[PDB]
Ligand binder design. Structure first.
Ligand SMILES: [Cl-]
Ligand SMILES: [Cl-]
Ligand SMILES: [Cl-]
Ligand SMILES: [Cl-]
Length: 460
């Protein structure tokens, strides 16, 4: 059938189900109190993760039997390395080790919040305490599970090499003023580089007589392969493309008056010689959403103007598409504005994992629930003003879901699930099942629907 599994957690019961489109989901399993607080899928779909006060547990196999156990007390957040080789557990409450003894941890782990585990052996590799002075993950992974890093804001970036979890060159990367950083989501083959490397971007604000900058570092050489100096900058956001082909930096800027001014989008061509940087566009309003097309070269933003009165009426939002120009040959033209939609309340972007199709949504709002299903490679005639661009934008269908909180695409990019979680509000928990086109296949009301989550499937 080529169906996909998914999990739903309602009340105190969680179950793995087959997908039957409009027909009722076939149930592989259902259990009561499988988890205490939440349920999370392993990124390659191998494990189902349950969380308890004592520990976090990994369920899997045809039997759906226990596979691994990680005795971290009172975990709130859990993350995996991209290749499922390692596990990261976090607790807001610092670990308290009993004098009686802990079956795995020791006094060295007391007062700490993070633990990094080796899944295969279930043994803890390192323990870390909370930083001096919400976001997740904090420990960020390289694409190949070889490096994991944490930001020491204003000072350095501590990079560790696995499986030993040893500090690289017995030193943290000194970067004065470093505000944030992101690894590339893939192992990038830059042109002409024969050596192994992993890439991450970072940024610093203005320091003394040096301007604010965005950097691109190669690990483990720790060489900076490209710097980009920026001016009049309020804040910087760094957005990697899925293959690591492109890196877009969003820059919040200001006037000499230091009033809010404009936002600039600039793009790195990471694979190309010299690492060229291009100035895409400068936009007046603030950006509240940004999303690259997975495995593609298209991205969407959602903007909203600045409020002066903090007025009762919600701000309307504008969604804009950007795509590269058509270019003769196996190359990609310069990034250009494609189209801006009419003002509306949208505030969420959900690209398909395949990346042709994107769902523009309106979630966590009481005034509107609208859903839009768009195609970027529609078999149609491009309008005159958008004719040179490498895209054919077309609305494939609309939909709605009252009190919607979340949406998730299926791995195959054929189905879109939306749901109202009990975690945010209890008024009308439900899940909708759509296809890519936006046709409502089925919906269902569950009294205490906590979460839907597709089971990830890596391409064979
Ligand atoms: Cl099947
Ligand atoms: Cl952003
Ligand atoms: Cl987003
Ligand atoms: Cl697939």
């Amino acid at each position: 059938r080529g169906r996909d599994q998914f999990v739903m957690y309602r009340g105190d019961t969680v179950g793995v189900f087959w997908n039957n489109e409009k027909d009722q989901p076939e149930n592989i399993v259902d259990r009561q109190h499988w988890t205490e607080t939440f349920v999370q899928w392993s990124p390659l779909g191998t494990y189902l993760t349950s969380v308890h006060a004592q520990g976090v547990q990994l369920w899997g196999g045809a039997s759906w039997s226990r596979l691994r156990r990680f005795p971290h007390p009172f975990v709130n957040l859990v993350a995996f390395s991209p290749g499922e080789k390692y596990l990261v557990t976090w607790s807001n409450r610092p670990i308290q080790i009993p004098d009686s003894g802990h079956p795995v941890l020791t006094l060295d782990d007391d007062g700490k919040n993070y633990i990094i585990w080796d899944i295969e052996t279930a043994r803890p590799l390192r323990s870390f305490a909370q930083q001096d002075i919400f976001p997740w993950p904090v420990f960020k992974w390289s694409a190949d599970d070889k490096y994991v890093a944490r930001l020491n804001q204003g000072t350095s970036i501590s990079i560790y090499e696995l499986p030993k979890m040893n500090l690289l060159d017995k030193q943290a990367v000194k970067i004065e003023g470093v505000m944030d950083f992101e690894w590339a989501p893939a192992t990038v083959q830059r042109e002409g580089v024969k050596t192994y490397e992993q890439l991450f971007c970072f940024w610093t604000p203005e320091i003394g007589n040096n301007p604010a900058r965005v950097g691109l570092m190669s690990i483990p050489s720790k060489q900076i392969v490209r710097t980009l100096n920026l001016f009049s900058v309020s804040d910087v956001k760094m957005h990697w493309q899925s293959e690591g082909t492109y890196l877009c930096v969003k820059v919040d800027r200001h006037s000499k008056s230091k009033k809010s001014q404009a936002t600039t989008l600039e793009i790195f061509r990471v694979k190309e010689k010299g690492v060229p940087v291009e100035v895409v566009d400068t936009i007046k309003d603030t950006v509240i959403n940004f999303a690259w097309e997975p495995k593609g070269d298209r991205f969407v933003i959602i903007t909203t103007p600045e409020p002066v009165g903090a007025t009762a009426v919600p701000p309307k939002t504008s969604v804009s598409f950007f795509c590269p120009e058509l270019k003769k040959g196996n190359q990609v033209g310069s990034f250009k504005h494609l189209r801006t939609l009419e003002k509306k309340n949208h505030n969420a972007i959900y690209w398909s994992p395949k990346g042709r199709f994107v769902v523009i949504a309106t979630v966590h709002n009481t005034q509107s629930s609208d859903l839009e299903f768009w195609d970027l490679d529609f078999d149609g005639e491009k309008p005159e003003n958008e004719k040179d661009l490498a895209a054919c934008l077309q609305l494939m269908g609309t939909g709605d879901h009252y009190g919607i909180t979340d949406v998730e695409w299926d791995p195959s990019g054929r189905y879109v699930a939306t749901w109202a979680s009990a975690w945010k509000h209890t008024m009308e928990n439900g899940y909708h099942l759509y296809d890519f086109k936006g046709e409502l296949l089925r919906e269902e009301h569950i009294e205490k629907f906590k979460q839907w989550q597709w089971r990830p499937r890596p391409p064979t």
